[PDB]
């Protein structure tokens, strides 16, 4: 009954009163005698959630039209090969804004469909420094503009997207969709594994422009077509039921704390916090980004030397928190920080940092 | 009680204890102060259930070795795709038994990636009698024979399976996985979607022989190779964690419940009292395969008219039965009577079947 201090990046904390709900009708949901696991996929009470789900999606994003929210299994990572499977075809290029980890594992996937070409990247920079909009710029053949809006890994996070005309722009928001309001017309594609920051693991939301995938590349495997999901509301085969029945609870809950502009304001906040204990530590934490490149879902931090990094995290989780060592491929810290992370978790982080501080420096 | 009488064809009935066992845990799972769903994939927590849910399941099967449990998301439906992708090769053809519904969409999928040959095929009988073993026959360039050991909308069940030499024999156990002893040495894969006996909806299980998945096809995309899972342990990117879990806990419950032997007889027991139900009933139920292809996983049976159907599952589900109507490709009425049907849905469902019939024919 006490709650860990969960700063895991992936899966991820989720609201507690979410857990509570889901616990209480597991067994027995609504009077039917089933769980929502053992339900139909094409009975009516499924369908109303799966359905749900999507309106309340669209609703939190203000109502845009003329996209459809998909329901695709296989994780953000199969979306990095179904995007170009079904978007990038011969003379054209994939063009990728290369910001880090997760933009670089996208590339690696449309070099294996077809031509691809960087629109802009900030490798020079070892990835501190966003690039700028100005600096992102398609070849003329390009299929589509795809861009990591939080690069989870590192810790930067774009504030803003470009606008990109006519070539579609698609945004792998896996780590912040649903943190922040943005207007999603800018978009033709967006994208996120529902376990970051939505948190149930399984469910991969694609939100799509209906006029991009009106008729997707007939040679594609059936589960690789984004028509098959647009076409058959994602029950062509059995959804992962489970995950998006928790998705909707989710959703419910970003209504219940004020939206995105309520879920924003609560993790600006619980970011402010954690930024400024690194950014008034004597030098003892250094963030791992460029402050105008900071993420408000994983902050990145190190500390002078890995053994005491090594210190730090063993000390953490001896006072109750999870997940803070940073990525293996990137060493440092993470702090995850993602909307169903409480404040409370962030005041006792800041607090295990100040005392951290004080006797290892 | 008050258990619906859930004889969903997929997703499907899951254990009550199973059910109550993942709800008491839900919230904080083993006193860690989060969920199973919060906690990272690569954590030694999670990694555990992973680990040991790939353990229980080889010990069903007897330990064979030299096979990999693999979990895949996207359903069997993705794995229709997956398997000739990694196997058919140029010059090679996938081999099919075309017994059915599911058979038929197994095929669909691999005329996309290459050549094909159906090497047996029940259609002359309407797929109500499955084609003898003898009547297999390959030609020398095939890649993989691949059968379907339950039909689950005809209502037909392979009993025994063929000896293919050097050619793989895959088979889509999706309706009947470990609900009955085989050897899995005659396979070089077979997969499931878990969602009928194994679990909830999402999570795919793939269990092949090494030797087989040593080396995929580099050009595929990165989540559609199978050595991506097996150099990996099905964790490359986010598994589907929850799904796996509850895995985990159905393969405990089968052991519970005397293993494969103790869940084969439990089911052949269920099959044979709705056999009996029909066969009694003086024509007016009538089973629609031949005997000897009878499953024990899904009955399919009909009435005199489709509206006399409709009749009888409306009648049903004021009684508490869900999921009875058959499937609507073929009509009929269809009891799908999986590991976690117990049989008192089926006792249940025999009587209803005689009071039915009292009041009319
Ligand atoms: C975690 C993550 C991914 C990979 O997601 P999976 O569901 O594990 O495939 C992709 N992009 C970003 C930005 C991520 O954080
Ligand atoms: C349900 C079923 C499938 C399809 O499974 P999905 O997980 O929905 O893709 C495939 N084969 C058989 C035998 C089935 O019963």
């Given at each position: 009954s006490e709650r860990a201090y969960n700063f895991n990046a992936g899966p991820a904390a989720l609201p507690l009163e979410v857990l509570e709900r889901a616990q209480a009708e597991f067994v027995d949901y609504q009077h039917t005698g089933?769980?929502?696991?053992?339900?139909?996929?094409?009975?009516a009470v499924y369908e109303a959630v799966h359905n749900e789900a999507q309106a309340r999606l669209l609703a939190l994003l203000?109502?845009?039209?003329?996209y459809k929210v998909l329901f695709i299994q296989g994780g953000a990572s199969t979306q990095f090969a179904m995007i170009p499977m079904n978007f990038l075809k011969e003379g054209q290029t994939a063009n990728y804004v290369m910001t880090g980890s997760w933009a670089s594992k996208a590339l690696k996937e449309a070099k294996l469909i077809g031509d691809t070409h960087?629109?802009?990247?900030?490798e020079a920079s070892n990835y501190m420094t966003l690039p700028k909009l100005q600096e992102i710029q398609l070849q003329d053949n390009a299929a589509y503009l795809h861009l990591t809006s939080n690069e989870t890994i590192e810790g930067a996070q774009f504030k803003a997207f470009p606008d990109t005309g006519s070539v579609p722009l698609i945004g792998?928001?896996?780590?912040?969709?649903?943190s922040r309001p943005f207007?999603?017309?800018?978009?033709?594609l967006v994208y996120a594994g529902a376990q970051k920051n939505l948190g149930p693991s399984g469910v991969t939301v694609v939100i799509v422009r209906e006029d991009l995938v009106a008729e997707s590349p007939k040679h594609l495997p059936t589960m690789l077509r984004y028509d098959t999901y647009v076409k058959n509301n994602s029950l062509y085969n059995t959804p992962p039921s489970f995950g998006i029945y928790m998705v909707n609870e989710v959703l419910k809950w970003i209504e219940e704390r004020g939206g995105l502009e309520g879920v924003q304001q609560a993790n600006r906040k619980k970011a402010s916090l954690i930024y400024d204990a690194i950014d008034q530590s004597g030098g003892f934490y250094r963030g791992c980004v460029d402050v105008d490149s900071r993420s408000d879902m994983n902050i990145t931090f190190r500390l002078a030397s890995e053994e005491l990094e090594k210190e730090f995290v063993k000390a953490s989780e001896q006072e109750?928190?999870?997940?803070?060592?940073?990525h293996r491929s990137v060493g440092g810290l993470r702090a995850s920080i993602y909307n169903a992370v409480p404040y409370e978790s962030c005041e006792a982080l800041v607090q295990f940092m100040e005392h951290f501080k004080r006797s290892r420096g």
């Amino acid at each position: 009954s006490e709650r860990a201090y969960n700063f895991n990046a992936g899966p991820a904390a989720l609201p507690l009163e979410v857990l509570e709900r889901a616990q209480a009708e597991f067994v027995d949901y609504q009077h039917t005698g089933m769980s929502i696991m053992e339900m139909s996929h094409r009975g009516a009470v499924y369908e109303a959630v799966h359905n749900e789900a999507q309106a309340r999606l669209l609703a939190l994003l203000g109502n845009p039209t003329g996209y459809k929210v998909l329901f695709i299994q296989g994780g953000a990572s199969t979306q990095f090969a179904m995007i170009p499977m079904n978007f990038l075809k011969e003379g054209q290029t994939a063009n990728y804004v290369m910001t880090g980890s997760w933009a670089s594992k996208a590339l690696k996937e449309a070099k294996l469909i077809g031509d691809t070409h960087v629109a802009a990247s900030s490798e020079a920079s070892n990835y501190m420094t966003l690039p700028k909009l100005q600096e992102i710029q398609l070849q003329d053949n390009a299929a589509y503009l795809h861009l990591t809006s939080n690069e989870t890994i590192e810790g930067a996070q774009f504030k803003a997207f470009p606008d990109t005309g006519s070539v579609p722009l698609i945004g792998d928001m896996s780590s912040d969709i649903l943190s922040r309001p943005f207007d999603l017309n800018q978009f033709g594609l967006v994208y996120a594994g529902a376990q970051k920051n939505l948190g149930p693991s399984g469910v991969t939301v694609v939100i799509v422009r209906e006029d991009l995938v009106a008729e997707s590349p007939k040679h594609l495997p059936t589960m690789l077509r984004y028509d098959t999901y647009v076409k058959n509301n994602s029950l062509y085969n059995t959804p992962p039921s489970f995950g998006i029945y928790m998705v909707n609870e989710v959703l419910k809950w970003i209504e219940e704390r004020g939206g995105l502009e309520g879920v924003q304001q609560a993790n600006r906040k619980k970011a402010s916090l954690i930024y400024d204990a690194i950014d008034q530590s004597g030098g003892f934490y250094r963030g791992c980004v460029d402050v105008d490149s900071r993420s408000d879902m994983n902050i990145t931090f190190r500390l002078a030397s890995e053994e005491l990094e090594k210190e730090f995290v063993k000390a953490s989780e001896q006072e109750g928190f999870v997940g803070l060592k940073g990525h293996r491929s990137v060493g440092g810290l993470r702090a995850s920080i993602y909307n169903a992370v409480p404040y409370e978790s962030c005041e006792a982080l800041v607090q295990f940092m100040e005392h951290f501080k004080r006797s290892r420096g």
